[PDB]
Amino acid sequence: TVASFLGLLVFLTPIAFILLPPILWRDELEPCGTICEGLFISMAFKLLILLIGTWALFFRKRRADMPRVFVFRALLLVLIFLFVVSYWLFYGVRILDSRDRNYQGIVQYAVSLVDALLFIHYLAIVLLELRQLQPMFTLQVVRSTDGESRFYSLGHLSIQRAALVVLENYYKDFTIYNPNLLTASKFRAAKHMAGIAAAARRRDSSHNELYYEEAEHERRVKKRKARLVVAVEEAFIHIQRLEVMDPREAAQAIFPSMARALQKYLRITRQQNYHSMESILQHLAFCITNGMTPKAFLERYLSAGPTLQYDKDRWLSTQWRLVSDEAVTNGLRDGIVFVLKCLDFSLVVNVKKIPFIILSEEFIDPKSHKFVLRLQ
Amino acid sequence: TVASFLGLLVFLTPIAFILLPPILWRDELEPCGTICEGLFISMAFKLLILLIGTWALFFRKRRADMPRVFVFRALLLVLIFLFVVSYWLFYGVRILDSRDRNYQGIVQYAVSLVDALLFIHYLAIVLLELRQLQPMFTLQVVRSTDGESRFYSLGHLSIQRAALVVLENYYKDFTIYNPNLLTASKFRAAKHMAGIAAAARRRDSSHNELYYEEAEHERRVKKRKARLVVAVEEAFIHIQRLEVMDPREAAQAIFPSMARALQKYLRITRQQNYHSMESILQHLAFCITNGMTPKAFLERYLSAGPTLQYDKDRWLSTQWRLVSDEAVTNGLRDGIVFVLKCLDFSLVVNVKKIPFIILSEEFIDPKSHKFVLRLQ
Amino acid sequence: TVASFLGLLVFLTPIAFILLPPILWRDELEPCGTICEGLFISMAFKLLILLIGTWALFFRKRRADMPRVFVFRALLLVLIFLFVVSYWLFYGVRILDSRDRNYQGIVQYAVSLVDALLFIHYLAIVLLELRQLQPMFTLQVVRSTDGESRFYSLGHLSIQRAALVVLENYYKDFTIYNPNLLTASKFRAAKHMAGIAAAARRRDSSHNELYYEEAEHERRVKKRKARLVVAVEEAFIHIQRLEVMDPREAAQAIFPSMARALQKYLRITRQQNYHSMESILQHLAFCITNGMTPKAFLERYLSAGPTLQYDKDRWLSTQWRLVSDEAVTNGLRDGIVFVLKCLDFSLVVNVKKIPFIILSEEFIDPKSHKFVLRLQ
């Protein structure tokens, strides 16, 4: 395409530095003999190592769109460009123009090119993968609706790359954003809007409704959970592993005996918008095929679950906004705050530094662990 | 042994390329002088670096037996074999046969060998340790008895290596498989086997036993836990840190005042098969020696605990089976399912891909956070 | 300073090996021509790569004080010292003394120096960052007051570096040490000290106070939590995002309507020593500025929270003591125990080895998942 063509040009540059004196002006070249051929073999093995490493670490599609320019890949592209153009200029001005008759020096120049390309590959993987390993900072990520918070540890990243790592961990650690679990407090606040220090005294002696409503709601959730467990066990017990039928029709056969209890449990825990009937039938046939217990079937539906269990059009990644005060290409430091705003919520992330820890030693004699039975 | 002998041959190959013209046919060699000696010193430092790195990253026992052939170590062994045999053939056909009189070229050939061996070591650690760092995929691992599930993040691994990482995390994250916590549902299902849409209506209006049995069982567990805490505190209070006695006899002295309450708590939570009396005495003497609180002693027994707290003959690793549809040497991709079957359960693992995330920016003026006290 | 001056000397050593024959004794040097100049260009690019990599991975302040000497950095410093002193001795005894007239060999000697310095940098990052990646051991860390325990996975570290990783994870995973949550058991033990097998029988039939005290305390905590949620919602509802006022004065305006309920909740959960009024006002203005819900404000105060949320003078890192039996520079192995003693508690850490896992395969026909509706 584009980058493959430039990679082909960089890969064929040392070979083109080799092949041109045995093509253009053969009648003048001194015989290299056994000096040149071992250099050719070493060049071939180093080009093979470079091709295998380049395929291993750089033949992959990009994974994110970052706001500003990525600094280190730009530095690597400028370095490779100046490097290859400088070698082509030195080959064209001195070697190819004046027709430098010793072929040994041209082969050694090409071997030095292949060596420096190998060290460019090493510097590339150092700048892109090894500087971020040693944990220098910690990050607190708080979602600004339910308050759920996680800590992470990162090295020397930029604000872009740290935000990308936080967004990687969001779909894995945090539960899915449920807007129906939040209206019960907003309706309560708008009910308080219908009607300072002295009023706060009359509030705490005036029969808290919230405790009894939470207790009654937890009792209803546990009762619906118990009836769901009974219905799913007595529904799974109706099929035998061996009329012969595929697992989709077996799921369709055992589903109408568990359907209404599951619908009532999804309504009582406010999860009815995440699970269609086709999703439940696909997961049911999945658990039927793999040979799973009814609790292994129900574990997807009992809890809230993380963001990436669900359908691909329910979680969304193509609209994230990075609110920050400084430039996002700057590295992390102690005491900065940046916000990852989604369409309805936000992840407030603040960074602290891992402190300077001083260790020392004690020399405890191991025979001092002998003691008595006196009343302590 | 075997691999140490081949490593010794690879390490002594450049030195043998050096030493043979100053042994066999000394009377013909031109004087190298100061050109050769700096190359000898650079060769010695590069061999020292190669030996230290080889000891640092490859002198260790293998950790797993994988079903099919490992692809990357086979590629590295084929690469090293073809490399060393090609250099021995080029040394024997051209240099040693024709007796190439310039010793400088032979020393430069050996230095090129040591350089290419260093880049082979670099390519080895790239293929074995650096390609798996960047998280490309996520994995859902569900145990098919109680439904307990974990998410993990992996890079470009094969199905073998991903299964090995899942089995690493199983002994650390998941609680131990307890078959006695599962018979209460199978007996209930077999009781339902003693005797579709209309029958599901009569079930949900017919006095759920499961909720009241769970509530009564939780009350009994909390009462036995309270009496266990009282017994363990009043048992630990009978010894003083200072008849002088070692911690084993102190554990034997304070154990008969906590033994029956611990036995009743292990029976009520169905953990009596995991903890013998000798295990409890060893852990008791451990917590006595290190100076730990009674709750620090009881935390091993209150919860279920992960798989690797227990005895080595209770968790088992020499029988795992990898059920998969495609070849297990293939890399991970989006939407595949593979099963790790143990002797009594299974880990169903399905792989999803981390999505393409698009970040953008907002430019919020920091003086817009000034606002009013009007009724919202 | 000191290390920057030595790094400048190491960086200027190859350039000083280059520049001295074109300064001291110019009248004798043979013309290098086009052989030397490509070596100069390759030398310049390799020095640039070395400088960028050295800045990327070694220009940072040290993060910890370890008890004994660090082995691998000492090995790297001895290696660099012997390397640079050996090249200066070989340059002074042979090249500079005898005035070696071929400048090509001197330039090749300098290029070999730059190559071996690049491999020294590679060996440095291998010994310091890559050997610890592959998980060989697991670690159980138990805090010896409340019993809270975590498992971690580490590679081939020393006891110093493993203790540093455990202390990194302590401020992130473990909740903060609260000494007021521990006196209720010590007062109970001292009450039992006011007054063996037969006495343990009379205890378990004598009205456990602890269960009813825990149930009543949990009821009081839930009631104070409910009134706190009501007070914080009706306090946040009194401001509108738009007299115009900054968020500090908005926090001061809405704080006296939530203050007493928060004070009662911090007293009932024994957290009144961690949160001053200024900390609550700063966090309140933080959540007001970022636009967070009242539950997002309260999540800092509802739970106990990890160690590093709080003030820098509350958690302490400059007094940790490493109690161990063997030398702390030794590597990890299976079955060792070391203790990290803080001023009032201790982390007992014991190390187990990740077991040798044997995988095999099953070949299940995918058409065997067709089955019947017979009564199981």
Describe this structure in words.
This is part of a larger assembly, with three copies of chain A (376 residues). In chain A, strands 3-2-6-5-4 form a five-stranded antiparallel sheet, covered by helices on one side. Helices cover 52% and strands 10% of the residues of chain A. Chain A contains twelve helices and seven strands. In chain A, helix 3 runs antiparallel to helix 4 and helix 8 packs antiparallel against helix 12. By secondary structure, chain A is α+β, with helices and mostly antiparallel strands. The radius of gyration of chain A is 33 Å and the shape is elongated. The first copy, chain A, starts with a helix and ends in a 14-residue tail after the last strand. The longest helix of chain A is centred in the first third of the chain and has 28 residues. The relative contact order of chain A is 0.11. Chains in contact: A-B, A-C, B-C. The interface between B and C is large, with 87 and 91 residues. Strand 7 of chain A pairs parallel with strand 4 of chain C.
Most extensive interface, chain pair and sizes: A-C, 91 and 88 residues
Count of strand segments of chain A = 7
Approximate helicity band of chain A: 40-55%
- Determine the number of helices of chain A (DSSP H or I, runs of at least 4 residues): 12
Strand content of chain A: 5-15%
Regarding quaternary structure, what we see is part of a larger assembly
Backbone shape of chain A: elongated
Order of helices and strands of chain A: HHEHHEEHHHHHHHHEEEE
Terminal-residue CA separation of chain A: 80 Å
Radius of gyration of chain A: 33 Å
Structural class of chain A: alpha+beta
What strand order characterises the main sheet of chain A?
3-2-6-5-4
Largest sheet of chain A: 5 strands, antiparallel
PDB class: membrane protein
Keywords: vangl, Planar cell polarity, PCP, membrane protein
Entry title: Human VANGL1 hexamer
Chains A, B, C: Vang-like protein 1
